[PDB]
Write a protein that binds this DNA or RNA. Structure first.
Lengths: 733, 730, 50, 485
RNA sequence: AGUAGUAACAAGAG
RNA sequence: UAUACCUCUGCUUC
């Protein structure tokens, strides 16, 4: 008797048992080595979709530019990037006509937001391309380097605090003939020592001023870094993703804020709608389309998906979109909003590491940097790369980068593109034919409803929608998209079948131990179960099972099995002692080899708070010792409820930096850290609330400490000695 | 400590780097240089942790005495190492070091801990003190709504909350004084007193404060209970296919009762309306309804709120009826006069037409807003008199404005400028009057200017006031500031007074069916009856399938005996009363077709049998109303197709599987032999039979308007479901 | 300035001025507001008193 | 502008829609049936169905792994003492001598009296581990001049055909045993009725999986990877021997420690997450590889004795193989218990949906049947070309097994195949429901799916199963096609 | 060898 | 050339 797990689908329908078609217990595919091939693929294809447009050499950068917009319409189903401005403007006019006031209101909100937005805002951009060192760095560091660099070119917009002067300095820095910036280099110095030879050589780092010419700077300012996307689910082959510089961030923020402020008020945009609310939108949007045409009215649903979404959409359109949307706004704001598209219209793409060539005979390998990419016979590359490199040539730059005028990068203008999709959804009809379409949009993923009298019309409506989208540079995936009679459909891995079904598989990877620490991961671990019980349809048995499995994973990961158990380990050896010593054993946390007291009803309660009354005074005292060394200097995506105890620790820093030339940044860091740690002692609220001021960081401390001294004296805390000493010290400062 | 700070400052300033950093860096830029580090963003912490936990010294300590109290090793086990951490510049250590510290470390001060983390403990007492009830299996309609996740101390906007936190924790650094301080001075005082002696770091106190001040509102699937202290237990309260009665401990709000009470009463009424002798049901149910812990009796008795349904029930059990209304912030009680709403179109001041329900008839209310009290006398679009007391300026003002708007005066309607069709922050369109309220509450100058003035009362006890809420000789037209501060119920739930006049209309309650706040319980058999559309639909069809054995048999014996059955009364309470009869008359006929003639369809019989309860309504001709789909109350989804399947009801003849609101049922072993090639046309229209198949010469698929107008004995084409043409005759 | 003002007011134990004062007298424990008018002083005075 | 453009745009630009009919659904992966290709070989990390665990009764509490394997081998000395290699089958590029030397080194190293589980870095160990096999990095300046150096053509997965060992693995892993392997920890006491219902449900749901085969295999993978990861980081440069351990409880309630084999940990200076550590597996078995040779081309099989298994004597074989893993897969191994939740939730959904219909806990009803209702029955599989009805528990265990196999064979091929085939599934559902589904470029769907079928056993089997099912549905369609009309 | 799969590891660095 | 059967590193990007 041959078992067939598919035969379940004879009994239970596919949506009802959709969880079993997701292999999320398995491993997701990671990348290996270089992504240059994947980047080059994108560069070639992006131009492949627009090569019948207008080619021209940029007199600024000296790069090869291609312009599809207002180009010849396609005569085939190959991904077209040839959008038509007029049609976009009409699609916009329709949206404005049906949503009047939104266009200017959103702009005013975004403007009034911008005006308040400070520079520090840029620090929360995660990985950012640092143009000074030409590497992906933390946003804060990439920003700091850019500010310190700007300071050398007499650009102190940052000192004012606001974003506007900084952005001004950014667009101004383009005019600079030679951009100067710091670069660190080492120096030997004989420090005194008790070392036979009475001295020691420590390489003290020192900063050096380095110059870049206007063009070479502009090229970096316009550059985008690239890397293969790891762990991307539900796909065979890998692909590339990009990272932006510090310059464009401020200009994108505003545009996305605007597009957000717009999208929020649209009813056919699924962004920034929470996954839970997306159903509230979708099911209703369906309910509307259902009861609209009773008499033989065939309501069809189309499970949409777009191809080459990023590689077809052109900045030149987004510029027009900003220009239209900002109609009523003043000029400076239009000029402000217009910049990011202008940059993306003239952007440059970096090609990652390169390609590794080898000899099996000699067992040798070597990476060929993108500059040296062509310093070799093309026959020595493999068959595909040989084809790619030939096609890359016309868009290739001397310094080893690829010019890329058309197309967008993976995840840049999500909002503003979603708007362009909704704009397609806004037409609803063409030529007064007997049908009406509506739908929901989300970047490259869309769901299209079409109501009409007979399906022959519906299909022509869908065809009209397709042919329409072509004019916006939006390309529907004939291969991945499919249509059916309304009642069931799929949208961003959410499955509707006369009501959205659960897809428990999707969230299953989150059940594991998160990797923050013992304290947090518990809270997270229970909270995930608690939430998945509510939203994703997990019964009490399965939930209670997950409660067990998580503790199982938790105790192995953090090596903290039951104190009564006999599992051996360095920690366990002490845990057992703690078990023997402690009286209120049920008061012990699992991290301390305590018993799991959680169940369905108290998932939402922190373990410490649960067990507090069961703890011994010394144990809770030690566990919650106010000045314990394990918890660091805290400072106020999902958040959790947890208590700050000894299990709330932080791990060691990655030490690989120690034996590289970036050692400096440790001293550069700690140099700040000292000043900030002190400034926090002077101003305790600094940790909570962002301090404000364009004045000197020292001045504040001086004044504050002076007042502290004076008041501590006159109140009767400090003695005349301490006051005179304090004032004597401060006097010098 | 100051001396130490200054000394450390001087020691730091020696370092030219630190000096230049302190001199060059700005107070703004502090926010940047703080986040400067060599650290990188961990893209796979789930892995990196599992890896790191297998290393020797994964953790980093803080440099200090408490670190030095930890020994290097302990009974062979290496606790920590000499090597410093790059970030902390303190020693590194193994996780064991934690387990040591917890076992043999220094015992620290934990006084205040409970008050600091009070917010969390309140959950623990809200669970520990709670009491659980019954668990019931059966369908549950979950409505996805934004709700408050946790109960707060006092809800504020983030900006307002942070300032309070700042006032509590860092009073010297609060900066510019806000009004908030004066409003929450008692809260500040309290938290200041409660969090004084503790040793815990302020940054934690601010977090816990912000947790219990700032609100966490999120979209969730909810059914019944929506109060925070219910939401926090939501995972246990319900599923899709089960319900759990839960009674949380601690005190509960009055408004939370007032919220649910209304829904409960409305829901009782909506059911009891359809069944003859409504009062009987209403009383039967209301007697045994429960709001969380309080009976509906105790609630209606104790609370002085209600609206319409509440009074009707109040008069059904026997107690006073507070005819009170709420216009946003304005609270009204009825002194005399019963007005009637009439939908008209008004051309409002700014120059736009608006469909508004104008209230005809004279009316007199006892009025209160915040602290300001008064008496209101109004007529159809006119403030006749407004006799108020003196109070705070904003209350007097808002009282007068809310009265001006509530009165629907033309002087108000013709005092609009710009636009008044703005949505709320979520993006929802407010109602015509509440928009005018939200508008004139802000921009009142137009109203006050457009209103008009007149002579003040010269009676000693009376006074008049002007636009700025100050005494004046020229008062606002119709405004006065004075110094001085049985019933029975019908079978059909209308309240009559001794003089024969009726004051409450059974058909005067709101059809709007909102989610309650607390646990709405019905301590009776057949709870479902007071349920949602789909719940009732499902339970009904289930009850049909459960008794199909007898119900299908009696249909060959008892003529109209089945059509009326206890269970169907509920179902009918779903159906629009304007269609119930038309549906019943059709269903009964289509069924009678399958009875009297030799063409049965069990799947259809089951589908239609519930619709036949309500007394039928045929056309003038004697023929019933033909239908494509039978619509139900609420949600465009909720309808039963006649030819095709539908979101609520569909049938799969391949597996003989009946789908009801998603749930699967098996009809196998309960189907006749000849239902194989038995077309559906013989149970789609009443008094119609399939002759042949689609004959092009007959033309197109004829619609209901045509089919009803066709003469008896006349062929026509009909489309069952997509791709199934049929040739039918009358 | 606000830190100074609030520190002084809080340390001395008095209400914080809602506006930003100019000086503070240590002996009197009183904040001081300085005004530089052109015409009459009496005019500029009672306007501040409001 | 829009319409004026649409007017002048070429007709060739269209969506080319077509209404889907069942005959358009041609069986996916036409090559998997071609015998001209090699049948897909077993490529997992450890053995699953063919596993043979040496059982050692204990107190039921943790001991040191070396001591455990030592005592186990002490119990079963006859196999441990066997120094005489009886080679049955040999992996093409393996080395009998090195492998057997490695096996003996493992056995003896573990069997010895000292604490350390370290192996001497011998030549056979260096071969089996793959010492110094990494290429030497050099300057680009050199490599550019060196004309012999070239970019390597990438290795593309081979095109395998269907193999029955997968089918059998599925048939067996889903079957019941008398041995429970799970290590489920304690939870808080029940108070609310929901918790009692859940707890009462777990007795039915959990045990149904725990008693089955796949559970033990899973726990083996988990517990193994758990330690392998620890050694990989704790002892990077040291070759170490790690036992394939799993504690088990029989129906009587006696804790038997199971030793399925011994594994050699390679050199693990793992920097990047994807960086590989080579692990050499020596696993006991009772399977004669000559029977299904196509299954074991990656393995080297010895014959090291015999045991009284089910009363009768059975020949004990030693399956020797050079394997490899990394931080990612070890972590995902450690997080494999979840294979429960995905299969347990999916069915508890059905128990809840049923309980909704009849208004009480329908668990016992679904599993065993009851006074009112019959037990739940599902179409579980085929038998000489006809359906077969399996119980709820079997339907559960089948899903659990599937979810396990998702991990054990999880890779890009599985991701792509699942993702792309899910669409065709949904279309087939639309057809089953008669919702008149249309397609725009079906060859695209197919081309998208079929490129993911190369040399993944579960993919290649799932394709076959999919075609069989798709076959059986088309017989069902014939019932609907002529309804009414 | 092997892991693995459109490119990598099978240690790297001073 | 050497120190170097030494030293540093395991997400730290060139």
């Amino acid at each position: 008797m041959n078992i067939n797990p598919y035969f379940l689908f004879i009994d239970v329908p596919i949506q009802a048992a959709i969880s079993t078609t997701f292999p999320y217990t398995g491993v997701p595919p990671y990348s290996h080595g270089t992504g240059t091939g994947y980047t080059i693929d994108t560069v070639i294809r992006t131009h492949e979709y627009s090569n019948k447009g207008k080619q021209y050499i940029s007199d600024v950068t000296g790069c090869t530019m291609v312009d599809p917009t207002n180009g010849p319409l396609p005569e085939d189903n190959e991904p077209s990037a040839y959008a038509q401005l007029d049609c976009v403007l009409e699609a916009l006019d329709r949206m404005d006509e049906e949503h009047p006031g939104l266009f200017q209101a959103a702009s005013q909100n975004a403007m009034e937001t911008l005006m308040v937005t400070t520079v520090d805002k840029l620090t929360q951009g995660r990985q950012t391309f640092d143009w000074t060192v030409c590497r992906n760095q933390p946003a804060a560091t990439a920003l700091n380097t850019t500010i310190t660099s700007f300071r050398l070119n007499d650009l102190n917009g940052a000192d004012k605090g606001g974003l506007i002067p900084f952005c001004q300095d950014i667009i101004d820095s383009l005019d600079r003939p030679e951009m100067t910036f710091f670069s660190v280099k080492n120096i030997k110095k004989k420090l005194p020592a008790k070392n036979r030879k009475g001295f020691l050589i420590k390489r003290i780092p020192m900063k050096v001023k380095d110059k870049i010419t206007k063009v070479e700077y502009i090229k970096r300012a316009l550059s985008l870094n690239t890397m293969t996307k790891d762990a991307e689910r539900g796909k065979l082959k890998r692909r590339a993703i990009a990272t932006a510089g510090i310059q464009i961030r401020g200009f994108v923020l505003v545009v996305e804020n605007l597009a957000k402020n717009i999208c929020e008020n649209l009813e056919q945009s699924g962004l920034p709608v929470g996954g839970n609310e997306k159903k509230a939108k979708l099911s209703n949007a369906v309910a509307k389309m259902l009861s609209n045409c009773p008499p033989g009215g065939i309501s069809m649903t189309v499970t949409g998906d777009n191809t080459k979404w990023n590689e077809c959409l052109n900045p030149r359109i987004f510029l027009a979109m900003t220009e239209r949307i900002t109609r009523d706004s003043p000029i400076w704001f239009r000029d402000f909003c217009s910049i990011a598209p202008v940059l993306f219209s003239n952007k440059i793409a970096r090609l990652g590491k390169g390609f590794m060539i080898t000899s099996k005979t000699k067992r040798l390998k070597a990476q060929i940097p993108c500059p040296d990419l062509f310093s070799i016979p093309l026959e020595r590359y493999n068959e595909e790369t040989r084809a790619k490199l030939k096609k890359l040539k016309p868009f290739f730059n001397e310094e080893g980068t690829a010019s890329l005028s058309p197309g967008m990068m993976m995840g840049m203008f999500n909002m503003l593109s979603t708007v362009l999709g909704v704009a397609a959804l806004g037409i609803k009809n063409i030529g007064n034919k007997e049908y009406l379409w509506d739908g929901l949009q989300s970047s490259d993923d869309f769901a299209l409803f079409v109501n009409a009298k007979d399906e022959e019309t519906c299909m022509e409506g869908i065809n009209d929608f397709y042919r329409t989208c072509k004019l916006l540079g939006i390309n529907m995936s004939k291969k991945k998209s499919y249509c059916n009679e309304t009642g069931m459909f799929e949208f961003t891995s959410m499955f509707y079948r006369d009501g959205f079904v659960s897809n428990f598989a999707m969230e299953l990877p989150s059940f594991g131990v998160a990797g923050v620490n013992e304290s947090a991961d518990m809270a997270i671990g229970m909270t995930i179960i608690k939430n998945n019980m509510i939203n994703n349809g997990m019964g009490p048995a399965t939930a209670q099972t997950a409660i067990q499995l998580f503790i199982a994973d938790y105790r192995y990961t953090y090596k903290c099995h039951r104190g009564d158990s006999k599992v051996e380990g360095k920690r366990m050896k002490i845990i057992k002692e703690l078990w023997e010593n402690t009286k209120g054993r049920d008061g012990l946390l699992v991290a301390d080899g305590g018993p799991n007291i959680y169940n369905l009803r108290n998932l939402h309660i922190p373990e410490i708070v649960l067990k507090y009354n069961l703890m011994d005074p010394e144990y809770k005292g030690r566990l919650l010792h106010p000045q314990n060394p394990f918890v660091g200097h805290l400072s106020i995506k999902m958040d959790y409820d947890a208590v700050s105890g000894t299990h709330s620790w932080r791990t060691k820093r990655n030490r690989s930096i120690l034996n590289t030339d970036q050692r400096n940044m440790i001293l550069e860091e700690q140099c700040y850290a000292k000043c900030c740690n002190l400034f926090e002692a002077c101003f305790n609220s600094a940790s909570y609330r962002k301090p404000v001021g364009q004045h000197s960081m020292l001045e504040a401390m001086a004044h504050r400490l002076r007042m502290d001294a004076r008041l501590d004296y006159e109140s009767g805390r400090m003695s005349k000695d301490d006051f005179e000493k304090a004032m004597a010290h401060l006097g010098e400062i | 400590m100051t001396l130490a700070k200054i000394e450390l400052l001087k020691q730091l300033l020696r370092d030219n780097e630190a000096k230049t950093v302190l001199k060059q860096t700005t107070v703004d830029q502090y926010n940047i240089i703080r986040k400067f580090n060599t650290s990188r963003i961990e893209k796979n912490p789930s892995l990196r942790m599992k890896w790191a936990m297998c290393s020797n010294f994964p953790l980093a300590l803080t440099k200090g005495d408490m670190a030095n109290r930890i020994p290097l090793e302990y009974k062979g086990i290496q606790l920590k190492t000499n090597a410093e951490d790059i970030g902390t510049k303190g020693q590194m250590c193994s996780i064991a070091a934690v387990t040591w510290w917890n076992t043999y470390g220094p015992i620290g001060d934990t006084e205040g801990f409970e008050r600091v983390y009070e917010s969390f403990f309140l959950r623990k007492m809200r669970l520990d003190n709670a009491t659980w009830g019954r668990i019931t299996f059966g369908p549950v309609e979950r409505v996805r709504k934004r709700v408050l996740l946790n109960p707060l101390t006092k809800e504020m906007p983030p900006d307002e909350a942070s300032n309070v936190i700042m006032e509590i924790l860092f009073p010297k650094e609060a900066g510019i004084p806000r009004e908030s301080t004066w409003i929450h001075r008692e809260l500040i005082k309290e938290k200041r007193e409660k969090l004084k002696g503790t040793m815990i770091t302020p940054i934690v106190l601010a977090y816990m404060l912000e947790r219990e001040l700032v609100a966490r509102r999120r979209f969730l699937p909810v059914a019944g209970a929506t109060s925070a202290e219910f939401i926090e237990m939501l995972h246990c309260l319900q599923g899709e296919n089960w319900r759990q009665i839960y009674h949380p401990g601690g005190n509960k709000l009055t408004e939370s009762r007032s919220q649910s009470m209304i829904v409960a009463c409305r829901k009782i009424i909506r059911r009891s309306i359809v069944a003859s002798n409504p009062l009987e049901l209403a009383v039967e149910i209301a007697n045994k309804t429960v709001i969380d812990t309080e009976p509906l009796k105790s609630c209606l008795a104790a609370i002085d709120g209600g609206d319409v349904a509440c009074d009707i029930i109040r008069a059904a059990l026997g107690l006073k009826i507070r005819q009170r209304q709420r216009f946003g912030r304005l609270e009204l009680k009825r002194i005399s006069g019963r007005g009637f709403k009439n939908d008209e179109e008004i051309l409002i001041g700014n120059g736009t037409i608006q469909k508004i329900g104008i209230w005809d008839g004279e009316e007199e209310f006892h009025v209160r807003c915040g602290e300001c009290r008064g008496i209101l006398k109004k007529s159809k679009m006119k403030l006749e008199k407004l006799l108020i007391n003196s109070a705070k300026k904003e209350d007097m003002r808002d009282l007068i404005i809310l009265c001006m708007v509530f009165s629907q005066d033309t002087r108000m309607f013709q005092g609009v400028r710009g636009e008044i069709n703005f949505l709320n922050r979520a993006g929802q369109l407010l109602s015509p009057m509440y928009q005018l309220q939200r508008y004139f509450l802000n921009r009142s100058n137009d109203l006050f200017d457009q209103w008009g003035y007149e002579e003040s009362p010269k009676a000693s006890e009376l006074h008049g006031i002007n636009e700025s809420m100050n005494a004046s000789d020229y008062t606002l037209k119709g405004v006065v500031v004075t110094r001085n501060v049985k019933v029975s119920i019908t079978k059909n739930l209308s309240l009559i007074k001794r003089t024969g006049e009726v004051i409450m209309g059974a058909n005067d309650v709101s059809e709007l069916e909102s989610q309650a706040q607390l646990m709405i319980t019905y301590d009776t058999p057949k709870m479902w009856e007071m349920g949602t559309t789909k719940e009732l639909v499902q339970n009904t069809y289930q009850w049909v399938l459960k008794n199909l054995v007898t119900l299908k048999a009696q249909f060959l014996l008892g003529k109209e005996d089945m059509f009326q059955w206890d269970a169907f009364e509920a179902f009918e309470s779903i159906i629009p009363q304007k269609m119930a009869g038309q549906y019943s008359g059709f269903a009964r006929a289509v069924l009678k077709q399958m009875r009297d003639q030799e063409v049965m369809k069990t799947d259809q019989f089951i589908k239609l049998l519930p619709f036949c309860f309500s007394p039928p309504k045929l056309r003038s001709n004697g023929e019933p109303y033909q239908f494509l789909k039978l619509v139900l109350k609420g949600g465009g989804e909720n309808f039963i197709e006649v030819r095709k399947g539908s979101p609520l009801f569909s049938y799969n003849p391949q597996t003989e599987v009946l789908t009801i609101c998603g749930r699967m049922m098996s009809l196998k072993g309960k189907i006749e032999d000849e239902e194989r090639n038995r077309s559906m046309g013989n149970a789609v229209l009443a008094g119609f039979l399939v002759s042949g198949k689609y004959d092009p010469d007959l033309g197109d698929f004829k619609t209901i308007e045509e089919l009803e107008k066709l003469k008896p004995g006349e062929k026509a084409n009909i489309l069952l479901y997509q791709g199934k043409p049929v040739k039918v005759v009358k | 300035a606000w830190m100074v003002q609030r520190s002084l007011a809080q340390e001395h134990g008095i209400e914080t001025p809602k506006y930003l004062a100019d000086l503070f007298d240590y002996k009197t424990k009183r904040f001081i507001e300085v005004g530089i008018t052109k015409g009459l002083a009496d005019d500029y005075f009672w306007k501040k008193k409001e | 502008a829009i319409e004026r453009n649409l007017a002048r745009m070429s007709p060739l630009v269209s969506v080319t829609p077509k209404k889907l009919t069942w005959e358009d659904l041609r069986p996916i992966g036409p090559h998997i049936y071609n015998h001209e290709l090699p049948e897909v070989p077993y490529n997992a990390f450890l053995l699953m169905s063919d596993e043979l665990g040496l059982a050692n009764m204990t107190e039921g509490k943790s001991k040191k792994p070396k001591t455990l394997a030592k005592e186990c081998l002490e119990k079963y000395s006859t196999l441990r003492d066997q120094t005489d290699p009886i080679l049955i089958m040999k992996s093409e590029k393996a080395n009998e001598n090195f492998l057997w030397k490695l096996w003996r080194d493992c056995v003896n190293t573990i069997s010895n009296e000292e604490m350390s589980n370290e192996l001497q870095k011998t030549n056979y160990a260096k071969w089996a581990t793959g010492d110094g096999l990494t290429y030497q990095k050099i300057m680009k300046e050199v490599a550019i001049d060196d004309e012999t150096m070239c970019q390597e053509e990438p290795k593309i997965p081979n095109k395998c055909r269907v193999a029955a060992w997968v089918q059998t693995e599925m048939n067996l892993l889903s079957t019941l045993t008398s041995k429970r392997a799970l290590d489920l920890p304690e939870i808080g006491p029940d108070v609310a009725p929901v918790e009692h219902v859940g707890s009462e449900r777990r007795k039915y749901f959990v045990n149904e999986i725990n008693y089955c085969k796949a559970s033990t295999v899973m726990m083996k993978y988990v517990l193994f990877h758990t330690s392998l990861l620890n050694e990989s980081n704790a002892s990077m440069g040291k070759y170490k021997v790690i036992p394939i351990t799993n504690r088990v409880v029989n129906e009587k309630g006696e804790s038997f420690d199971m030793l399925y084999g011994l594994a050699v940990k390679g050199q693990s200076h793992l920097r990047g997450d994807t960086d590989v550590v080579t692990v050499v597996t020596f696993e006991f078995s009772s399977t004669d590889p000559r029977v299904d040779s196509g299954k074991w081309p990656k393995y080297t099989v010895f014959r090291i004795g015999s045991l009284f298994v089910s009363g009768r004597e059975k020949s004990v074989y030693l399956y020797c193989r050079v394997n490899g893993t990394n931080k990612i897969q070890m972590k995902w191994g450690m997080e494999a218990r979840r294979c429960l939740l995905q299969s347990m939730q999916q069915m508890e959904a059905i128990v809840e949906q049923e309980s909704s219909i009849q208004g009480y806990d329908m668990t016992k009803a679904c599993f065993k049947g009851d006074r009112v209702n019959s037990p739940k029955t599902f179409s579980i599989g085929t038998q000489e070309g006809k359906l077969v009805k399996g119980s709820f528990g079997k339907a559960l265990r089948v899903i659990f097994t599937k979810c396990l196999m998702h991990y054990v064979f999880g890779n890009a091929q599985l991701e792509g195949f699942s993702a792309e085939s899910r669409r065709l599934l949904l279309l087939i559902q639309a057809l089953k429901d008669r919702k008149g589904p249309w397609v725009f470029d079906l060859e695209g769907m197919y081309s998208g799916i079929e490129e993911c079928i190369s040399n993944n056993p579960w993919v290649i089997q799932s394709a076959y199963w999919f075609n069989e099912w798709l076959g059986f549905e088309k017989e069902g369609s014939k019932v609907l096609e002529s309804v009414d009309e």
